Amino acid sequence: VQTQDFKTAVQPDTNTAQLIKTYSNPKQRGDK
């Protein structure tokens, strides 16, 4: 899972979110 370019109030790059993204959306690019 790729990290986002920068953090946002609505979308923080939390470890829990990245763990959920493994099965929810593993193909997200992360390029804003």
Q: What is the resolution of this structure in A?
A: 2.6
Burial zone of 13 (CB within 10 Å; 0-12 exposed, 13-18 middle, 19+ buried): middle
Experimental technique of record: cryo-EM
For the chain, how long is the longest CA-to-CA vector? 23
Q: How far is CA 26 from CA 1, 11, 16, in A?
A: 6, 16, 14
CA distance 12 to 16: 10
